[PDB]
Design a protein around this ligand. Structure first.
Ligand SMILES: CC(=O)N[C@H]1[C@@H](OP(=O)(O)OP(=O)(O)OC[C@H]2O[C@@H](n3ccc(=O)[nH]c3=O)[C@H](O)[C@@H]2O)O[C@H](CO)[C@@H](O)[C@@H]1O
Ligand SMILES: CC(=O)N[C@H]1[C@@H](OP(=O)(O)OP(=O)(O)OC[C@H]2O[C@@H](n3ccc(=O)[nH]c3=O)[C@H](O)[C@@H]2O)O[C@H](CO)[C@@H](O)[C@@H]1O
Ligand SMILES: CC(=O)N[C@H]1[C@@H](OP(=O)(O)OP(=O)(O)OC[C@H]2O[C@@H](n3ccc(=O)[nH]c3=O)[C@H](O)[C@@H]2O)O[C@H](CO)[C@@H](O)[C@@H]1O
Ligand SMILES: [Mg+2]
Ligand SMILES: [Mg+2]
Ligand SMILES: [Mg+2]
Ligand code: NA
Lengths: 446, 446, 446
């Protein structure tokens, strides 16, 4: 029986933020969520998240996914684990304690940790790693025969102890029953005057209880994020992880070290992604689609065989074979039908665009229902706002909207209609009709 | 006498692509072409490229540059070399065998390899290297006195052999006459059930024939591209190589690790290139020209003293002192004369623009022949498409095209003419004349 | 008493530039300025900058901040120091000699260097470092008991000496009085036929004078920039330094290795900066402001809570809560009031924009004084240029400028006025009035 305790009540002073540290994002989701996803790998029967500093913000993120306990005052990591007593005290099993600021630890690593704990029949197992720059991390102190003696914090470590490269990742597995009894013996006699969870290791050794340490196969997973310098490193490692997975899946990257793809983004095989492409949120990219430098897609679905050249697309659906850009902007609630062509300096907002329709230049399409095979001449402006209300415009199939025209909603351009270039349309244009609304040209010789 | 055999018939399963692996691009050209260019350094009397999987695509790339032999079934690298028998069997000389998926090996390295082979009078010389992650590479097995015994593939290697860091690059030089006789002794008794070319090393040792190994000076050249993770590494190394050459040539780079310049791009001294600039194909950049972040140039010629700010330029010519951007788009078959200024949100397509002409904002110039010292007011739209045909517009010198005007082709604006702002022009405007075609302003008090 | 000598007279041949090497920029300022800033840390009583090659360009950069001496001919680093004789000869104190092409050395390092020199009572102290690629650097030659014997240049070094990893940084501290007497003994007997300053070390040893070497704590500071490859490395290290400082200060960076922020840019806590953001010159960013990929800001002030999405802003002021982009361009001498919204494909030039005003699409606002709560419809074009003169337009508060309208200066749109969409305005529109200037729509059935 496995139990889990996630610490997320800290102040995170070094972050210099009003937003709780654990909520800072890494590849699209908070560090806390990355940790929560890893925890699920051990299939815990009970999950408790310790909240305190701005608990309401934290509870909203994991609402309905974990039990919450409040730590009124941030008196220490050990004190935080004590808050889980009313829920876990008495139960029999292996209790995992993990920090909410170590977003790189994988579920696979946590599984190996618990398996090690059970196999070696330890009362406490520490997840460790080694690094050439252990500053800020608790050091793992062992004796001559490599037996774990205790964990000494940076601020409490001697110069000899500071030289230790083996660090505490902040993740452990404790025998649930022995954990809460050992917690009662933690004192505040240290540089911070806090209840260190790291002290339970020394406490267990007093009664000769078995304590071990499982070393991470990948030391990059050990990153503890206390400031924004560490947060950038987490972004770097997570970015490499995500992009590596995509490349193994058959996605080409001109530069995986400079491409920004969120954790839950899905990408089909044969997709070509240039450097400096950004894909955020619930974004999906179809097979063989090409994304060029500067393309920025948020919560959108893009089909197969599409080519998105240096363009921004938000909360929209893009069908197969759609060509967009460069410098195009597809705003929320828009839908581009199959083989639609949206060129440079074109903005589509809250509009549905039928198959094969083209708007290649300096055009604004807002709140419009557009048919198939429609052609928007360069400079076409649709007007949906008058100062108070928002009106809709309907454009039929095979409509030819003349260049530099101004279409004032609410109006409807019937099938096969034509709007003369430079015209201002304020009234419906019947199907197959031709509308012209501009001044006559007069030349004055000189 | 040197001969060359390039293997390009494989399936490249790990790539997860319909495009033959060797055809995947690195810095603008296929891996196969990079390998072909290196091969030329040995000045081979005969060059044979083994094709099989989608041979027609491969033959098109190197058409008229090498002899081709078909390998109906991909039974192995050794089997592939056997396909070159009808052409190379009997001839006397040093035969180089190279894979089409090792695009980083230089011609200089191949020259050193053949020179080593001849000097040491070997029957077979293997191009080797060392790496901390030899996974997937054939390991070089030597005895106590560092003599090459054989090459063992990843899938056939024991745990002891897998620990070997010295890898086979897939490039060798064989005595042509002894090569084809040793090929007859290759068996399919291995994990893949294939005819390994790597086995000829062991076969030569049976008759006490001299086999050696030449080690690469630069281990980065040893990269074997079997998947897209490796392809990204190839892009990274090739990108560093290309940009290093440019910096030595006097080109400044804010960030050479994040600048994307194709293999055949030419850049003059004193050019300043910000990070995230992309130069593709047959692009040439003149002296002292400045390219800012986001600029993307494809198959174009840009002169000296030009400033291309965050703009995309395709298949066009840009003269000296031209200023473009930010967010400008120069489309195919366009020509910008000396000191032309193209500003933000301006698109030029299939048009010639005379010296000193300015179009600084929200303008579309398509299929136009424009003179010198012309001024396009912001919002100027030229119309060349009516729904079926494409018409041309001619604009003379010193013409002042009023802002937000719509010029409907085919029309001609004579020298020194002026088009009033907001006008729709459907007829020719004589030289020195003034054309106005808009509605009169009426104010309604309230 | 501390004195300083900065060498900036060299030709910098490897740079292949008409601009003196020391003037090449690193993070917004010349290498010379970075060196000058570091020098100030030792609080020198006298500062002398040796100029020669294009001295006028160099003197302009540090005008009024240092004394200048001319080196007519570039006969060597030793010869350059000799030019400072008329000013420093006779004085008593510690004289620091530093190259103008080592922009990474910090003031803290120079302080530690002088303190070492004084403490050890040396006649000469060399600032050294160690590197695996010492090519081009003078090597530090020591004896069995680690005593500094001399400095041997790359071109004069034997194969044994070339293997030395300890390099000369080009920075030293000499006893002023003994310095000028030792300079008289420097000869041109070397590969370059120049007067090496490095030779004074050997000269001092002839009379048994105390010479030492202080080693840099950070070897990255030792970079000597002789070509553009080294200049890119300097940019890389300086970029990392600058961004690290910002992260410690509470600024988040998606990718600090690919974000370009100049040396004097100021950024408040809680600011979020995506990768590929460029901030240049005297730019200041307020608290909680978000900067997305592609944003490029030069000499501008941006307030708190602003969101600059993929936009370019130059020499302008942006107030709190302003939303800009994507693909917007704020040109010189513009001011955006609190909560102003500037959308895609909008250019603002030399204009003041009042609070809450919105221009969300394809609009050009030039030389305009705009009030508060004004709404610019998509496609709105302001005209300020007629061919010779520049005219101003004044727009009152709560004005509704209809889409695709053309406003021809000089004109004034009074408070609460409205311009009908597609209108060309050539005359003043009184407050509360409605102006319409377009052609009537005529439909022709078919
Ligand atoms: C005493 C202790 O455990 N030290 C460990 C902690 O140091 P470190 O100094 O990083 O500890 P933090 O301040 O980041 O706290 C760790 C976690 O506990 C939380 N928290 C903190 C204080 C509190 O009163 N309530 C609460 O819930 C924080 O929100 C965070 O999720 O993690 C490092 C690894 O990353 C380890 O090397 C250290 O050995
Ligand atoms: C058996 C063999 O040679 N193994 C070598 C091969 O492994 P590796 O597993 O990389 O071999 P690949 O599958 O990439 O084949 C190598 C080359 O031969 C071609 N090909 C393959 C099979 C075929 O039947 N016909 C054909 O033409 C492929 O197109 C490719 O150009 O290259 C590695 C270096 O990169 C070496 O370390 C391995 O020792
Ligand atoms: C002889 C000498 O000093 N060599 C040092 C110099 O080599 P390095 O070959 O780099 O010397 P440079 O040519 O860059 O000259 C150094 C500095 O002196 C200036 N200059 C040069 C020649 C001249 O006649 N007048 C003049 O003012 C240059 O402008 C530059 O600021 O710096 C390296 C560190 O970066 C050291 O490892 C070398 O030991
Ligand atoms: Mg922590
Ligand atoms: Mg291979
Ligand atoms: Mg130098
Ligand atoms: Na217009």
């Amino acid at each position: 029986s496995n139990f889990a305790i996630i610490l997320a009540a800290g102040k995170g002073t070094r972050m210099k933020s009003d937003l709780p540290k654990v909520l800072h994002k890494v590849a699209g989701i908070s560090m806390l969520e990355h940790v929560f996803r890893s925890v699920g790998a051990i299939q815990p029967e009970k999950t408790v998240t310790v909240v305190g500093h701005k608990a309401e913000l934290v509870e909203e993120v994991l609402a309905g996914q974990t039990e919450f306990v409040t730590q009124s005052e941030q008196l220490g990591t050990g004190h935080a684990v004590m808050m889980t007593e009313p829920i876990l005290e008495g139960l029999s099993g292996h209790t995992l304690v993990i920090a909410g600021d170590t977003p790189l630890i994988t579920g696979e690593s946590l599984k190996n940790l618990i398996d090690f704990h059970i196999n070696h029949k330890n009362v406490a197992t520490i997840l460790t790693a080694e690094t050439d720059n252990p500053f800020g991390y608790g050091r793992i102190v062992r004796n001559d025969n490599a037996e774990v003696l205790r964990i000494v914090e940076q601020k409490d470590a001697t110069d000899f102890e500071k030289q230790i490269k083996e660090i505490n990742t902040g993740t452990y597995v404790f025998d649930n029953e022995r954990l809460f009894e050992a917690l009662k013996n933690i004192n505040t006699n240290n540089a911070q005057g806090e209840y260190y969870i790291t002290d339970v290791i020394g406490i267990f050794r007093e009664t000769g209880e078995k304590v071990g340490a499982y070393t991470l196969k990948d030391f990059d997973e050990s990153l503890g994020v206390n400031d924004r310098v560490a947060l950038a490193t987490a972004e770097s490692v997570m970015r490499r992880r995500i992009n590596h997975k995509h490349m193994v899946n058959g996605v080409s990257f001109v530069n995986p070290e400079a491409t920004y793809i969120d954790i839950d983004v899905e990408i089909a095989s044969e997709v070509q992604i240039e450097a400096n492409v950004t894909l955020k949120g619930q974004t999906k990219i179809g097979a063989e689609t090409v994304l060029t430098n500067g393309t920025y897609v948020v919560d959108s679905t893009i089909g197969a065989g599409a080519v998105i050249t240096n363009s921004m697309i938000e909360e929209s659906s893009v069908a197969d074979g759609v060509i967009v850009g460069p410098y195009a902007h597809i705003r929320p609630n828009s839908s581009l039908g199959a083989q639609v062509h949206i060129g440079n300096f074109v903005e589509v907002k809250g509009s549905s665009i039928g198959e094969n329709t083209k708007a290649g230049h300096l055009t604004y399409i807002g709140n419009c229902e557009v048919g198939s095979n429609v052609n928007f001449g360069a400079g076409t402006i649709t007007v949906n706002y008058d100062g108070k209300n928002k009106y809709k415009t309907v454009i039929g199939n095979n409509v030819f909207v003349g260049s530099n025209s101004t279409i004032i909603a609410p109006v409807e351009l019937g099938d096969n209609s034509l709007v003369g270039a430079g015209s201002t349309i304020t009234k419906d244009v019947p199907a197959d009709a031709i509308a012209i609304g501009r001044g006559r040209q007069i030349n004055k010789d000189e």
